Every structure is written in C-alpha cells, then in structure tokens.
Amino acid sequence: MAAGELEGGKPLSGLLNALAQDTFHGYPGITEELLRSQLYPEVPPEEFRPFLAKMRGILKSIASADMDFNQLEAFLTAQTKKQGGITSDQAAVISKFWKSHKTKIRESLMNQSRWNSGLRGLSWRVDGKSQSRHSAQIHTPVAIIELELGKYGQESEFLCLEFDEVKVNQILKTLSEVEESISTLIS
Amino acid sequence: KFVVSSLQGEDCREAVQRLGVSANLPEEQLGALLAGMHTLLQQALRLPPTSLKPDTFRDQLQELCIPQDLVGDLASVVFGSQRPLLDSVAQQQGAWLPHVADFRWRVDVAISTSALARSLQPSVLMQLKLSDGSAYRFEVPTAKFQELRYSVALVLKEMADLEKRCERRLQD
Amino acid sequence: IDMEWKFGVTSGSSELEKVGSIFLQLKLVVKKGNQTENVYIELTLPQFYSFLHEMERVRTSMECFC
Amino acid sequence: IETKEEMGDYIRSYSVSQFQKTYSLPEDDDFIKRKEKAIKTVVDLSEVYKPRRKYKRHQGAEELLDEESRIHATLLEYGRRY
Amino acid sequence: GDSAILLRAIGSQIRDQLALPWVPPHLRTPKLQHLQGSALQKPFHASRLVVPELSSRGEPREFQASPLLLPVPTQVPQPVGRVASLLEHHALQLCQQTGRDRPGDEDWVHRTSRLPPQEDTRAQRQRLQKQLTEHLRQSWGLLGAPIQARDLGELLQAWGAGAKTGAPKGSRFT
Amino acid sequence: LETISFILEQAVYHNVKPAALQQQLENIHLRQDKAEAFVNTWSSMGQETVEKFRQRILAPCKLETVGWQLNLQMAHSAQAKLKSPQAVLQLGVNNEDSKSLEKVLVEFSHKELFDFYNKLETIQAQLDSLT
Amino acid sequence: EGTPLWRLQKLPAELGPQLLHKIIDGICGRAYPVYQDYHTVWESEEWMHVLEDIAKFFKAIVGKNLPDEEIFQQLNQLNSLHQETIMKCVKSRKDEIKQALSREIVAISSAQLQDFDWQVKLALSSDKIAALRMPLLSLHLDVKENGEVKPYSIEMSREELQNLIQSLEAANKVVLQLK
Amino acid sequence: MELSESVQKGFQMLADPRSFDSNAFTLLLRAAFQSLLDAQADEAVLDHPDLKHIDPVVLKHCHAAAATYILEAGKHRADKSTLSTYLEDCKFDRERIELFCTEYQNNKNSLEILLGSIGRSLPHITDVSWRLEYQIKTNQLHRMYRPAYLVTLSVQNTDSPSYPEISFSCSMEQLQDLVGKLKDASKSLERATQL
Amino acid sequence: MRFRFCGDLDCPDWVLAEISTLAKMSSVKLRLLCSQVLKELLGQGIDYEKILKLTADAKFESGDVKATVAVLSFILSSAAKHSVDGESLSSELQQLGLPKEHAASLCRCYEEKQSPLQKHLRVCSLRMNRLAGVGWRVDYTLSSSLLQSVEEPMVHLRLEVAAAPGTPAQPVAMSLSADKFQVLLAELKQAQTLMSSLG
Amino acid sequence: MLLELSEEHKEHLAFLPQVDSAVVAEFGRIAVEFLRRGANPKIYEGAARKLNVSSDTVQHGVEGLTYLLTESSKLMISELDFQDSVFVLGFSEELNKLLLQLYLDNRKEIRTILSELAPSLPSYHNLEWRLDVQLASRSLRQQIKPAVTIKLHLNQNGDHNTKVLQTDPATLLHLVQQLEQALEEMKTNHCRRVVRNIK
Amino acid sequence: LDAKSDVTNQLVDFQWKLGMAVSSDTCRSLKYPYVAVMLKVADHSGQVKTKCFEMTIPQFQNFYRQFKEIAAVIETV
Amino acid sequence: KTSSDSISRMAVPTCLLQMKIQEDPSLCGDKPSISAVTVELSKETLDTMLDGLGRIRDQLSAVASK
C-alpha cells in the first residue's frame, strides 16, 4: 500500500541513516529496525521487505565513484522515474545527505578494506649515553622509536628500535628515495 | 613368529613383505591370514592359563579345516617362555591417565618480606613430572599439605579394605 | 612500577636432608606496553650482594650531571 | 520387579539420556549456573569443619615397616573417629 | 548410464575393500597401508621452473645449451615436486595461452583477427593509468602539505651544547 | 584512603603496639578522634591481619583444592579376570599469573601410592625440626 | 674494500660459472651450491659472506637496471676472465632474477599463498538421511604467515562455489585490464 | 585434456626422422619416464652418447613436452585410443605410436600410484583399546557402585608424522549409543554395496 | 521379525517400552504435542510449558514426558530417514501395540509436513565447514626498492568460514600474485565443470 | 561408616536444643536453600531483624545442620544408624524425628549435587557420521576412494569439544567388533559376581 | 653474551614498495595511493623477525619529517 | 633523555637494567629457554629499591651480630 513513500519522510531518512550505520560504520549493536516496526505501525501486511532491497540497491549504487552532485541527479531521476520513485525534493534531500557523510563513508570503506598492519601513531625519543657497567665514559647518542601497529578490529602491538648516526642517515636516504620515486611518477 | 614380534610393538613390515615376495603369495591372502592369527592369539592371551586349559584349547581347535601339526606351534607360543613377556606388555595396556615419573621438593623458612618485617612461615615448594611429558611446579602451604597427606592415608586405607573384600566376597 | 621480595632460608630438599642455603626471591611488575607482566627471579647471597653494590654504583653515576 | 528397583532401571535412564542430548528442560537450564554456587558452598563448609592436625603421635614410633600398621598410626595424628 | 554405472562401480569397490579384513599397522604391506591408512600421503608443492625456449637470439642460448641448465623435469630432488611443478607450469602456460592466440567463438575470435601485439590495447588502458597517476599526483599538497618548516632543523647547529657534567659524584646510602 | 591504607600497611609491617600509634600519629597534627578510631580498630583485628599476611604467597602457582576417586579395574582389551584396585587424584593448581585455574589428573596403584606416602612422610619429618 | 665481489678472486676462472649459476638457481627457488664442492677455496664463515654478497649484488644490479658501462666499470679490478663471466651471466638470465624480485615484492604483506590442492567427493548418506547425494568440493590451502606455513581447509557445495567463482571473475575483469 | 602450443611444437618436432631415429626416440622416451619416476635421478638421463648429435635446446624442449604429455595422460586416465588418435594427429607412423603405447603400458601402474599419493586428509584412526572399571567413591561421595568405560583411540595425522591418542570416558548407555551409531554406519555401507 | 522405519533392523527396546507410555494419552493432545516437537525439529522453536500443560491432565512426571518427547523425535526422524510413508508407518506402529486411533492421529500431521522436514534434514546434515562470504581487493604496484619499476597487479582475498551453527566465523586472509590467482580460478572452473554433471 | 560425631562440631549443635522445633524446621529449610540457591549471610541480617537473634550463632547452627545433612546423605546410612547417632545430642524425640525425616526427604537431590565434585574427565556426548567417496583430485580425475567421516563430541568440565576424524570400512568393522566385546563382559560370571557381592 | 649496545632490537634491513588500491568487492573505484614497508629485525637471541605494515601519504610524510627532526636533534648533541 | 617528540629538550637521568634468566628445561618443554629482560627505571624507583635492599642488608647484619 502507498504508506510512507508519498506521506512520511521521517521513517525513510531514519532507515537510510540506520542502514549507513549498520553497513558502513560498523555499529550494528542497536538499530532503529526493531523500534520503527512497533512505533510506526505502517508495516504492509505482505509487501514490506522488497522495498528495503531497493533501499540497499540505491545505497550501494551511489557508493561506486562518488561523482559530482550535478551527475548524481541524472542517475537518481533515471532510476527513480518509475513507480514509487523518490521526489525531486526528496532527491535533493538525499543528495545533500551524501555530503553529510561522504568522508566518513569513504574512510570506513578504506578502514573496512585493510589487509596488513597499519600505522596508528609514531612516538620517538633521542638520548645521550653516559656509561655502563664496565665502560666508564661514553657520549655517542642514540634514538628510540616505538611503532603503534595493529590490524583493524584487533589489539595494537608495539615495536621498539635502536639507532645511531649512520643508520639514521641510511634510513633518511631511503625515505628520500621513496619521496623522489613518488615525485617522478606523476608525469 | 612375525605376528608375535608385532605384539610387543616392534615394526616388522619389511620382513613380511620379503616373505610374501619369496613365497609368491598375493597380499589379499597374506593379510587375511595375518589378521586371523593376530585376532586368534589376542583373544587367546586375554585369559590366564587357569581359565584356558590345553585340553579345551585343542578340542575347540577341532581338526575340521585345521591341521594337526600347527596346534603344537600354537600351544608352544601361548604356553612357551614368551608368555611372561606377553603378559608383562599386556599388563602395560591397562592404563588411561599419566603416572608420576618423579617427585622433588624444597622446604623454605620465610624470614622477611616486603609486606612484613619478620614472617617466619614455613613453606614447601613442589615439582612434579608425568609420563605424558608434563612438568608442574607450585607452592603448597602447610595446611594444604596436611590435607593432601590425610587424603593419601585415607585412600591407602580404603584400598586395603577393597583388597581384603576382593578375596572374601568372591570366593563363596 | 612495583616490586616485591622475600628473604628466607632453606632447611632441606629432596636429595639433602639438612642444608641452610639462603636465597632471595623477587617479583618485578614491568609495564610491557599497554599490558602488564611479572618477572620472578631467585638470587643467591653473593649475587644479591653484588646486585646491591651495582645499584649503589648506578646511584652514584646517576646523580653526576644533576 | 524387586531387583529392578536396584539395577533394572536401565531403559528409563537410556531414554532420559537420549532426550537430554538435544534438549534442556527449563528447570535444569538455570541448574547449570546453580551448580557452581552449590560446589562453592560445600567446599567452604568442608573448610569450616576441615579435619585439622591438632593432635600428635608420641615420638618414637618409627620401628614399623608395614603397609597396614603405619597408615593406621598416621590417621591417629588427626584424631578422626574410625 | 553414468548416474547408475558410477553407483555400480562404487558398490563393487566398497565390496572389494570390505573383503580385506583389518590388520595391525605393524604388519601392513604398502598396498594395505594405502587402503587402511594415510601414512604415505605427501603434500602438493610447486617450485619455480625454467625451460629452454625455441628462440636463438644469442647469448642466452649458450646457457640454454650448457650442462648448467639441467633438464626441466630433474631440476628438483623429489619426484612429487617434479610432477607438481610440471603440472602448474603447464597450467600457467595454458592460461597465458588463453589470453593469446585462441581459436574461440564467433565473437571472441573477432579481436584476434587484427590485434597488434599489446599495442592497440595501450590506448584504452592509458586512460586508466592516467587516473592512477593523477590520483597519485594529488595528496602531494592537497592536505597537510606544505610541510616547509626549515626552522627547527638547522638552528640547533649554531648554538651547540653549552653545559656539561663535572667530576664523579656520589653520596652515602640513606 | 590511600594514606590510611599506607599507615595501616606500615603498622602491620612493624607489628606495633597500639601505644606506638597513639603516640606517633598525633605528632603529625592529627586530631584525637582520628587517633582513637585508628587505635581501637588496630586493637580489634590487628593480629588477624598479620596472620593473613603470614600465609601470603609470592610464587605464581599455588595448590588450592584436592580431590580423589577410587575405582576397581576388572578387565581390558589385552587381559581379563582382574581384581586390581586403582586410584585417581586431582590437584587444583591456581595459575595466579593468568587469574585462572588448571587441573592435573594423576593415576596410582598401591605401590606408587605407598611410595608417594613415604615421600610425604619424609617431607613431614623435615617440617618437624622447627618445633 | 672495493666491490663486494672482491672475495671471488680466490676461485679460479674455471669454477666460476658453476658457482654463479647455481647461486642464481638458488635465488629463483631451487637449491644452492653445497660446501663440499668448493670448500678448499673458502672458509664456511666467509663462504656465507661471499654467497650473500653475490646474491645481493645480482639483485641490486637487476632491479636498478644499470647500463652496460656502469656494470662493466664496477668489475674493473676483478680477474681478467671473471668479468666477462659475470657480464654474460647477467645477460643470460636477467629475466629469471626479475621474476624472483617481483615475486618477493608480494612478500610485503601479512601472509602469502604458497600452494593448494582440491578434492571432489560425492556424499551418499548420513545419519540424518540415506538419500543425500551431495557433491562437495574440499579446498586445501597452505598460506605462509609470519615465518611459518599454516594449512587451511574449506568445504563448499555448488552454490558457495558458484558465488566464489563469480566474485573471483569480477576481480579478474579488473586484473586483466590492469595489465 | 587441453594442451599448450609449446608441447604441440615439441611433438611436431619429435616426428621428424631426421631429428630423431627409432633408437633416439626410444631413448628420449625412456629418459623422460626415468626422470618422472626415479627419486635418485641426475643429468645422466641425457648423458647417453647416442643422443649426442642434436642441439640440446630441442632435445630438452621435447623432453619436457613428453613428460608433460605423460603427466596429463596419467591424470586424465587416458587409454590406447586417445593417445593413438592424438599421436596420429601429430603426423606419426605405426612404429612410433606402437612404441609409445608399449612404454606407457610398461610402467603405467607406478604412474597411477604416484599421482594418487598427493594431498592431505583428515586424521585416520587405526584401532581402539578399552578398560572396564567399577566406580566406588569420590572425596564428597561415599557409595556409588557404577561401572564406567575408558576408551582410547589410536590416530595418525598425515599433517604430522606422529601417533597421537584421543581418550574419553563413557558409561554403558553412552557406549550402547556409540555402538548403535557405528552399526548404523556399517549398515549404510552394506546398503551401498548391495546397490 | 523386523521393521523398516528403523532402517530394516529390529526395533530398539527403549522405543518399544516408551511407545506404550505415549499410548496413555488423548489423540487430540497428541496432534498438538507431535506438532510442537515437529516444529522444534523444523527450527521454529519449542515451548516446554505448552507440552507440560497439554500433558498436565495425565500427571506424567519427568521420566514419562522425557521418554515421550524422545520417542516422538526419534521415530519421526527415523521414518523420514528412509522416506517412509504414512500408510506403512501406521501399520508398523500397529504392530508395535499403538492403537489404530493414535496411529491415524499422528500420521495426520506426520504425512503433511514430511517435505519441509526432509529438506531441512538435508540442509542440516553433517558438514565440517562452509564459506559464508568472500571479499577481494586489487592492487597495482608502481615502484619498489627491490625493483625500480614493476607495473604489475596483485590480488587480496578474504574467506569467511562458519565451522558450526551459532559459532563465530574465523576469517582467512592471503595475498596472491596474478599467476596464482589465474591458475586458482581456472582450477575452480574445472572443478565446477566436473561437479555439475552429478544432477 | 557410622556418624561418630566430632566434639567441636557437636558444640555448634547446642543452639538448636535450646530452640523449639518450629524454628528448627525453618533452619532445615534454610539449609536446603543454602545447598540449592546458595548461601547469603545477608539472611543473617534478615533473621536478626525479624527475630532479634544474634547472627553469629545462627550461622553456626545452620552450617552445622547443613554439614550433618551432607555427611549423612554422603553415605546413605540406614535410619536406625542415624537414630543411634543423634541419640548423643540430648535432643527431643520430636526434634530427632524431624531431623531424620528432613534428612530422609532430601538425599537424592543432595547426592546429585555432590556428584559434581569428583575429578572432571572427558566424556562422550554425541557422535555424527557421514559417508563420502573421493572422485577427483588435482592430479587424478577418475578415482574411487570411499571413506567414513566422523565428528566426535566430548565434554570436559562443562565445555563442548569437537574432533574431526576419518576411517575406512574394515577399520569401522573392527571398531564395532571390539566395542561389542567391551559391553559383553558385563554379562559374564566375573562381572556379575563383582557387581552382586558388593551390594 | 652480554653487550650494552644491543638492548631491545636492531633492524638489519629496510625494504618498501609503492602501490595503489584499484578496486574492491564493496567499491569498484577505491583508487587511493598507499606505501608499505617491511622490517626484518634481530633481538638478543640473534634471530631475525619480519614485521610489515602499510601507511598512507600523509602518514609517510609525517614519518619522514619526524626522522628529519631526530637527525637534527641527535646531530646538535 | 635529551629530547623527545612532546618536548624539544631536557636533561634527565635514566637507567636501563638488563638481566639474564635461566629456566629449568623441564618447565618450558624441550627448549633451554634462556631469556633476557630490560627495565627502564627512574630516580624514585631506584631510591625505593635501594632503601629496601639496604633494610634487608641491615637486618642480615643485625642477625649476624646478634
């Protein structure tokens, strides 16, 4: 029956945001799915799920390349010029909402795409040695760096390292080569 | 002979293969023969000689489909000088859980502690190894040690009671 | 972060009936990253004395600059 | 039928074991949690009345070399009534 | 046929395998070891392999005709390695064949008629590489950068170190 | 609360008499109500605290529970017509390092249990030199 | 002390190609030359050093794709004959070294796939029913992670297999055009 | 049963009498079989002076092609007709085809055994042992008198060359249910056999 | 002699003993109790309060109700094991002592739900693993320290496996070269071609 | 064998004799509650509030009564022995009868509770079998290698543990043959004598 | 076997790669650059581990700047 | 500690105590399991360590002289 689609907007946008939370942001704990059904009683007796499938289809369709909003309106109209399609005002409303959560969606997609340990922060220290048990006088300095590594959804590991002048210079040279390779490949 | 050597856990596959090659015997028949002998001997050795007399033995072995000259070998292997070895290894098959391999301890007398200037509390350190390859080391205060000792003594007493009851309650 | 110790005397063992071997036990609460670990050690008398002397030396050397 | 009350109840136990394999009657569902408290209570109460070695054997009873007498003597230290 | 003949063959095999009784493993000939166990089952591993090529362009052919290049099947010690590596080599060769000359269907053979060697394809993948390299060109200044902070680095050299420690110092334990 | 706990830890460390507390805490500008509350409580359950600490342990493994089972074995695959008793002991070892408990399952015969009992008796004789 | 190949002079001109080519074979994935073939010419603790030096020099030269002269000039102070052996060795099997280097690039990751084997079976009957006839594909994987080879097993039916093939073909439609 | 272009070219070259005679063809085929089969092979497979007149490149290319063809035929359980037809499509004669078929037949069984020995499997059990006891008492229970069964399985893992043993404790009812399950499995096997 | 619903084997003893206990009930209440246990097998759920209330009239205690439910599940699953029909099962039950009325009443519901039960049993049969889902990513390497210029792709795969119902899924991760990916895809297609001719 | 009580434990039973049976029954109910639903000393506060009775001695009495019940059910001693044992406590005959009846009515439940204190060993729970035949592999395409898949479930100290195995028809026959011998000894003269003369 | 210079770790080799992710199951135009690193490190035992992680461009430039600052500070004193 | 990420400069004493441990082979399996540890201390922790160890030493000396 023609309930909600042409009448209520609040349930529709609520479902869109709940789906965004459920599928992109990784917070499926408590969603509006279980509350709207008994708080909004407009559940169709027979055809209630398949329209959620079109919800999912449109949600994934725009998630491909994130085009400029000038080109999103054309596709939204083309997909939605049929029965039960979204309105022009509602098309603008949903087009706005993409800007409201674009960067977060992209980051969650990249975050929910990682395959190896990622860098979650660098903390270092540079010291000056004095002496030891047998040695009585030393001045050569060192550097201490600790790496925050961890795959998404798992406890982070820590790695500690030691350095002196020569090795620091070598690492700086290697990073400089990395930068040069990054620079020369644009053209 | 090969079957008997197998009952002590030794690997003797190659000699069996050589015998099969020498005698021109299909594997399908050698395997069945080996299985038959192994099962027959295993069932025979379960019982003690008191529960299985030679008379009944060869009477059951009754000639139909049986040679007369092989039962002598069967009796010799069952009632020979190898029977003590077979029983000894057979006795070793009745085990489920690990047995104690060694037991070492060390008793200390705590004189001082960070949380107490003078403790003066006797303590016992225990290490235990098991046939599975497991090694365990732990502390054991005095009261827990007394509990353990009392439990061991009670178990000894009850085991003696069962040992007494076995003869009296089954020879009627 | 934290440390504990226990100083005591042995009065026997599995293979010696009587012996008065002194010993010292330590527990070190070391912050192994975001987690915590405990390091349990045992020392003999000469080793403990040498450790104390070495710590005295480290204290002397650690207050030289300021 | 009299010996059944002692050792002939096999079939009922077999059927109960078969049923309980894939089912849990509600009374027994929370019994699994009640079990831990029951065991804690019984162990603590046994701790209250733990048999304690407040009594001693007179020194000098070391001549015995037996597996029947010295164990009997050992229990005398705990004063437990047998 | 097969839907029934396969069942008949399976039944015959099961009957034959049931015919042989169980024997202790210590008295097991290799055939039974295959039947009544899996002790002699090896894994599958493929090792990199190099083969001579019918290309006589020069210097490399000297190596290809030398004893230094061992025959292809005998480049690995174990025969299982040999068979596995040869099978994977053939499969990979055929896969590279699939993306090469192939007498296929009425439409898949269409491009094969006039396809230059990896040249006519370059026009329509240069567009993809253009997107890749233009995405790389971004973020080198899009955010965070410019990082030009040449103030914390070299100034420390001028000042140097001013203070220093003196003589060995110590005190009495408290 | 931390300061009070530290004061109590010091007091039990030194096993001081309540008079020492009454004398010394008041010296540091503490009002008399606090001193009386301290001294009465110290007199109340002081020796219980030191006895509790006296049984403290530092090693990461302790023995916590003891259990045993008695069985009679009568037959198995390679033998029959047996009348041999057997015993099982379970040891509750608390892995205080992991805040978890493991269990050790051990099995004995008469001779092994007698040897174990003799070893425990020897350990007991060792502990009796400290009377 | 000059080029890392300076330790190679002790070995005469005759036994150079064998050592070099067997080392390259070891790099590609085959076995490495054994000690008991050239033991008289080197000591083990330094044989390892020269082995590593040769391997790393070859890897660097192939990876950076140096021109003829610069490779030639670095070998000026070697034996009168070893230089041409080295240059011919580089000219012959450069592509194998490049392939090994490209394979090692994939080693920059948490885990890598080494090899696999699949078995197909026909499930006939089970305790639930005696008319099952369920084809099942078993997939075995040997994936190397950290520094150890971890085996895995997956059991699939026709639907899961079809979905997996569909996803992998979707990925292949990108892989094929990315080349 | 698909084949690659390089193998096709190798088999095309193998037919030419100028490149190979009957003796050279037989020696190459036998060398390929030895390399595929023997576990102690070396370069000696090609050190047979009769073959020392042709370029090693073609020699080894055809050696690899022949080994690949034998491997594929063994994997696909090919028979006389398929090999004969493909070789006939390769411009062979009735002599080379016959010798190839004979060489395939000579050591077919070893090749069939070899390819069937690759792969893993779930742990395979070998035998069982049982101990019968009569429970009496525990520390907190003093009169039970209930028989209990001890079981021990002997299994060997193809993944680790060892013989780990699995142990579990069963009662009479559990043992009866287990025996019933195994008997049902046996009856299912018999049903499969009858069909 | 023997019966077929137990797979052409002699009927067990516990079922024989406890079917009589089942027979001391009302047929209409059976039509609901068997429905409840059958729905429990079908996965809808079981309300033990419902069955206790339904059999509350006869004051059947724990053992009797336990045996009754066990027998219902056992016999229904065994009959569905060999695709046995209502007409034969009713006669076999009559041979077991159950009155004809109870056999008719039970087969009224048993005969009308065998298809969902059998399909669920097929789905819920023994299995070791199952591929819940799959995910992939493609990488294109440009430059590296080992090799200055590469310009070749890479494939990342993730496989999610459910080892049992109501169990956490343990993912699998791996990194593949193009060649391994292509060979794997080809071998999977070969396996599918071999494995689609069995139906 | 007989509850020859300890003096120190007896001293804690002095509270009840100075207490009427009306509250002794409540104390027994409290003991049953402590066994089943657990112990809560806050009930001491409730008892003090509702009766103005000291908590310490009430705790002593309840724990002593519970200990008596536990060690009386732990042996299943006959009623006459129990009557003889409690004759030394100087208790009223009505209170003695109440104690004996309360002990009698709650023996089986207690013994069910106590059986969870024995050492926990791996135990059989369920077994599943599947039959399959291998048809193809990556090296051989046409094969016939039948095998039996087994999933064995074991319970250890309250957890569920699973094992995946495999076997062949001959080994399965051997397993059945051996396990049939396993449960054939209990029908023999030796086992019968052992299980009969003991009880 | 006691040396003050090595306390915790000392990396023996440093390798890196540059690549960008093109497509994914949940997104066909992912297309972002990234840079990876492989570290093989040696502890007091004398063994060699292998730790690998992935970074982005901003993180990499932060890494480079921090190492530059470390070099300056260590040089000055 | 001359400098750090969150502070451009300082001069603070620090200690790095390293130790060697031998554990019984039986308690760890088939390995010798000889490990090395490192703990980074500060002034207050070192002072507490030294005070406690000196207290223990004084107790031992008093017992010796008693």
Short mmCIF file of C-alpha atoms in Angstrom, two decimals, chain E residues 7-8 10-12 14-15 18 22 25 28 34-44 51-55 61 63-67 69-74 77-80 82-84 86-87 90-91 93-94 97-98 101-102, chain H residues 2-9 13 34-43 45-46 55-58 60-61 63-64 67-68 71-72 75 113-122 124-127 156-158 189-190 192-193 195:
data_model
loop_
_atom_site.label_atom_id
_atom_site.label_comp_id
_atom_site.label_asym_id
_atom_site.label_seq_id
_atom_site.Cartn_x
_atom_site.Cartn_y
_atom_site.Cartn_z
CA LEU E 7 26.94 -46.31 -8.44
CA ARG E 8 27.62 -49.89 -9.57
CA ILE E 10 31.24 -47.61 -6.24
CA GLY E 11 29.40 -50.63 -4.87
CA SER E 12 31.93 -53.02 -6.40
CA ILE E 14 33.18 -50.96 -1.48
CA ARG E 15 32.59 -54.72 -1.62
CA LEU E 18 35.25 -54.78 2.71
CA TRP E 22 41.75 -55.30 9.28
CA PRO E 25 49.70 -51.45 11.03
CA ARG E 28 50.93 -53.78 6.77
CA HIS E 34 47.31 -47.23 1.09
CA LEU E 35 43.95 -48.86 1.86
CA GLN E 36 43.84 -48.93 5.68
CA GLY E 37 45.72 -45.69 6.38
CA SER E 38 47.24 -42.48 5.08
CA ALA E 39 50.79 -42.63 6.47
CA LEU E 40 52.38 -42.38 3.00
CA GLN E 41 50.44 -39.34 1.73
CA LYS E 42 52.60 -36.42 0.60
CA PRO E 43 51.52 -32.79 0.16
CA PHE E 44 51.38 -30.72 -3.04
CA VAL E 51 62.55 -24.30 -19.58
CA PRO E 52 64.55 -23.86 -22.81
CA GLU E 53 62.85 -21.69 -25.43
CA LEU E 54 62.95 -22.09 -29.21
CA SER E 55 64.43 -18.60 -29.60
CA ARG E 61 71.16 -19.67 -25.91
CA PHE E 63 73.38 -21.12 -21.25
CA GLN E 64 70.34 -23.00 -22.55
CA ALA E 65 72.61 -25.50 -24.34
CA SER E 66 75.02 -25.92 -21.41
CA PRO E 67 75.06 -28.55 -18.64
CA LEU E 69 70.79 -25.74 -17.27
CA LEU E 70 69.64 -29.14 -16.03
CA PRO E 71 66.79 -30.93 -17.84
CA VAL E 72 63.45 -29.45 -16.85
CA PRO E 73 61.92 -32.47 -15.02
CA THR E 74 65.09 -33.09 -12.96
CA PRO E 77 65.10 -33.64 -5.92
CA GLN E 78 61.74 -35.26 -5.17
CA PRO E 79 59.50 -36.73 -7.91
CA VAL E 80 56.37 -35.28 -6.29
CA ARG E 82 58.67 -32.66 -10.28
CA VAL E 83 55.10 -33.66 -11.14
CA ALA E 84 53.52 -30.78 -9.19
CA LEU E 86 55.34 -29.56 -14.25
CA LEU E 87 51.55 -29.58 -13.86
CA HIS E 90 51.62 -26.41 -18.00
CA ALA E 91 48.52 -24.87 -16.43
CA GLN E 93 51.36 -21.75 -19.86
CA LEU E 94 47.84 -22.62 -20.99
CA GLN E 97 47.71 -19.05 -23.94
CA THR E 98 44.08 -18.20 -23.16
CA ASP E 101 46.09 -16.80 -29.87
CA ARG E 102 42.99 -18.94 -29.35
CA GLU H 2 43.91 -29.49 -23.16
CA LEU H 3 47.49 -28.94 -24.34
CA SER H 4 49.69 -25.90 -24.90
CA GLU H 5 51.28 -24.64 -28.10
CA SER H 6 54.84 -25.40 -26.97
CA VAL H 7 54.00 -29.06 -26.30
CA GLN H 8 52.38 -29.22 -29.74
CA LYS H 9 55.55 -27.87 -31.37
CA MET H 13 59.45 -31.96 -33.96
CA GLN H 34 63.01 -42.28 -15.63
CA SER H 35 63.09 -38.57 -14.79
CA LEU H 36 59.38 -38.65 -13.92
CA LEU H 37 59.68 -41.85 -11.88
CA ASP H 38 63.06 -42.31 -10.20
CA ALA H 39 63.79 -40.39 -7.00
CA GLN H 40 67.59 -40.51 -7.45
CA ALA H 41 67.95 -39.01 -10.92
CA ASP H 42 70.58 -36.59 -12.23
CA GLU H 43 71.73 -35.08 -15.53
CA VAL H 45 69.33 -39.00 -18.16
CA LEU H 46 70.71 -37.14 -21.20
CA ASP H 55 71.01 -29.41 -30.37
CA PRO H 56 70.31 -29.69 -26.61
CA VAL H 57 67.64 -26.97 -26.80
CA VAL H 58 65.28 -29.02 -28.99
CA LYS H 60 65.20 -30.68 -23.69
CA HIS H 61 62.12 -28.92 -25.08
CA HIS H 63 61.84 -33.98 -23.18
CA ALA H 64 59.69 -31.53 -21.23
CA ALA H 67 56.95 -35.54 -19.66
CA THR H 68 54.01 -33.12 -19.71
CA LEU H 71 51.60 -36.50 -16.81
CA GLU H 72 48.41 -35.25 -18.46
CA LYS H 75 46.00 -37.51 -14.66
CA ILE H 113 50.22 -44.89 -7.83
CA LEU H 114 52.32 -41.70 -7.84
CA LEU H 115 49.59 -39.18 -8.69
CA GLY H 116 47.25 -40.83 -6.18
CA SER H 117 49.67 -40.15 -3.32
CA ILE H 118 49.41 -36.33 -3.40
CA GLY H 119 47.15 -34.46 -0.99
CA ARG H 120 46.04 -34.22 2.63
CA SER H 121 43.27 -35.92 4.58
CA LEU H 122 41.56 -35.88 7.94
CA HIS H 124 42.72 -41.71 10.09
CA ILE H 125 42.03 -43.96 13.07
CA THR H 126 43.64 -47.40 13.34
CA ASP H 127 42.46 -49.25 16.47
CA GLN H 156 47.79 -40.75 12.95
CA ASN H 157 47.80 -37.31 11.34
CA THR H 158 49.04 -37.05 7.76
CA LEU H 189 27.94 -49.17 3.82
CA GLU H 190 26.30 -52.55 3.25
CA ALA H 192 25.63 -49.01 -0.71
CA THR H 193 27.37 -52.28 -1.56
CA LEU H 195 23.05 -51.47 -4.85
#
